[PDB]
């Protein structure tokens, strides 16, 4: 059913907002290897919507306290946050017999892609969405003990 790699006047990858590639397009199988690809990318040259973009302040006074009697932005957070979920569950894992190596390859490629991209901020992200699992009431208990 063909690849349909041609078409896709969507990627805008070869940004080239000028159609100047039109000039080159106008200008054994070498002749075919040239002309066929020249047309194949000329049909892409119509993708000119990237540049000539016409782009274009910073009060950022401060994140004011939420009425916490002076100090704020951490003491309230670490004083109030105590909730623990009753239950924690692992993601479901599908059980299949010997699976195709092609799906394995694609999913593994995705597994590669996710890191590096996330690596620089993977750590920063990992500090978050790690819901607390337990607490430890301090010797403030000694009050009633």
């Amino acid at each position: 059913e063909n690849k349909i790699t041609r078409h896709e006047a969507e990627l805008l990858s070869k940004k080239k907002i000028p159609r100047k590639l039109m000039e080159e397009i106008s200008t054994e199988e070498k002749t075919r290897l040239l002309k066929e690809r020249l047309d194949q990318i000329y049909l892409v040259n119509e993708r000119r919507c990237s540049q000539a973009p016409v782009y274009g302040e910073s009060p950022s006074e401060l994140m004011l306290t939420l009425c916490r009697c002076g100090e704020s932005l951490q003491d309230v957070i670490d004083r109030v946050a105590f909730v623990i979920p009753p239950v924690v569950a692992a993601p479901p894992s599908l059980r299949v017999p010997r699976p195709p190596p092609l799906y394995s390859h694609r999913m593994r490629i995705l597994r590669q892609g996710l890191r590096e991209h996330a690596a620089p901020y993977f750590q920063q992200l990992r500090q978050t969405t790690a819901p607390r699992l337990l607490q430890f009431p301090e010797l403030r208990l000694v009050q009633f003990d």
Binding site: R68, D75, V76, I77, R79, V80, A81, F82, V83, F144
Partner: protein, 431 residues
């Protein structure tokens, strides 16, 4: 200054003596003496704060200070006690169910006060030396009583070097937190160099011993606790107000934990007050939900306002007194407001003139009072500042009754407007 002279700026309280007898004039208020009595009783009971779930409604003619009564109440209450006023139409939202909105308002009204001891030191930056290679550090401080010298912590080293504090300054550090705060420069500190650098004022050297313990107290609302702990980094949503369907298990867990913190002297709760305007704007669903919303212990007193009479229940075809189903009606008591008298109107208008700081003729007072009585008080309140502007345009000071008639002619009133619309009914479509 952001404020501006408002319709209800003249209100400053309720003007009730110690025995709760209203005074014929006090903190900008007079009239409805029975209403003032009842409101004083309500405020007293709120101070008592020994009971929950009570509710009360105010009914009467429109434009008879019901909102003014409520605002005087809120003013006299004080800032310590939490308070919140909202409009019936505001609950209807496209982000959440109405019941969740009512729960959010309720939890907002109530407040919690947390008490906790502190441990801090503060003094001059007598001298500091840092010894980058880890970093070795030595430092000393002092106060108006004695002086001391201490080593320097590696994390203390990072903290201070990021603070980039200058020797001779006055600062305070907490041991447990290890977070420093500059509290204003000192004579030697800001004596600075020959080099310009900057210019600044000074602060007095601290006193007493460096270490001070000391206790700090804070306050937060129940809804705030709910939101902050709800999504685990739902904290920023507090401002965005994007909180949705805060689950019930969270509510009960917070209730349990707050109760147990409470009975152990850790903190003290405070029963807030919540006022809803145009309560008739609620449908039957909200009536049903709030009807039970009063049994939960965390029940701030409610105050409602509406002037209707035997009106269709919102969302149905049933006429009821003020359009509120009898089930609620039997759960609360009422207060009525009468239309004002003659001389009291003179007093009110004189008070508003004082508010505006525009002092004018006596005949003007008589004529304007009679006109307002005949038409309405609100139109008189509108005419006050208009006449002031006209007279200032005359370049004189004392507004004259002729000027009052001029302005009155300039701005037709409700009765005149309908009389006009009658003068040519076909002027405007859909009659």
């Amino acid at each position: 200054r952001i404020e501006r002279i408002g319709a209800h700026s003249h209100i400053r309280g309720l003007g009730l003596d110690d025995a709760l007898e209203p005074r014929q004039a006090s903190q900008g208020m007079v009239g409805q003496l029975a209403a003032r009595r009842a409101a004083g009783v309500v405020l007293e009971m709120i101070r008592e704060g020994k009971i929950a779930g009570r509710a009360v409604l105010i009914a009467g003619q429109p434009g008879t200070g019901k909102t003014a009564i409520a605002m005087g109440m809120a003013q006299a209450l004080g800032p310590d006690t939490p308070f919140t006023a909202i409009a019936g139409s505001e609950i209807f939202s496209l982000e959440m169910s109405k019941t969740e909105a009512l729960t959010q308002a309720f939890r907002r009204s109530i407040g919690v006060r947390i008490k906790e001891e502190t441990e801090i030191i503060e003094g001059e930056v007598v001298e500091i030396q840092i010894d980058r290679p880890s970093k070795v550090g030595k430092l000393t401080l002092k106060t108006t009583e004695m002086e001391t010298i201490y080593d320097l912590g590696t994390k203390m080293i990072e903290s201070l070097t990021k603070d980039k504090v200058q020797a001779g300054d006055v600062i305070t550090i907490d041991k447990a937190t290890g977070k420093i705060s500059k509290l204003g420069r000192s004579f030697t500190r800001a004596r600075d160099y020959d080099a310009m650098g900057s210019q600044t004022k000074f602060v007095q050297c601290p006193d007493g011993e460096l270490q001070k313990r000391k206790e700090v107290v804070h306050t937060v609302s129940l809804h705030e606790i709910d939101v902050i702990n709800s999504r685990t980094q739902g904290f920023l949503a507090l401002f965005s107000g994007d909180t949705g369907e805060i689950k019930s298990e969270v509510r009960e867990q917070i209730n349990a934990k707050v109760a147990e913190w409470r009975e152990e002297g850790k903190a003290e709760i405070i029963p807030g007050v919540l006022f809803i305007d145009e309560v008739h704007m609620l449908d039957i669903e909200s009536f049903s939900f709030l009807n039970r919303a009063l049994e939960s212990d965390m029940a701030p007193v409610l105050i409602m306002a509406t002037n209707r009479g035997i009106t269709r229940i919102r969302g149905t075809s049933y006429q009821s007194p003020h359009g509120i189903p009898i089930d609620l009606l039997d759960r609360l008591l009422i207060v009525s407001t009468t239309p004002y008298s003659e001389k009291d109107t003179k007093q009110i208008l004189r008070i508003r003139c004082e508010e505006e700081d525009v002092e004018m003729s006596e005949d003007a007072y008589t004529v304007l009072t009679r006109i307002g009585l005949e038409t309405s008080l609100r139109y008189a309140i509108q005419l006050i500042t208009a006449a002031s502007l006209v007279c200032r345009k005359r370049k004189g000071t004392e507004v004259q009754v002729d000027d009052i008639k001029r302005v009155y002619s300039l701005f037709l009133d409700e009765s005149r407007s309908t009389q006009y619309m009658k003068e040519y009914q076909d002027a405007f479509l859909f009659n």
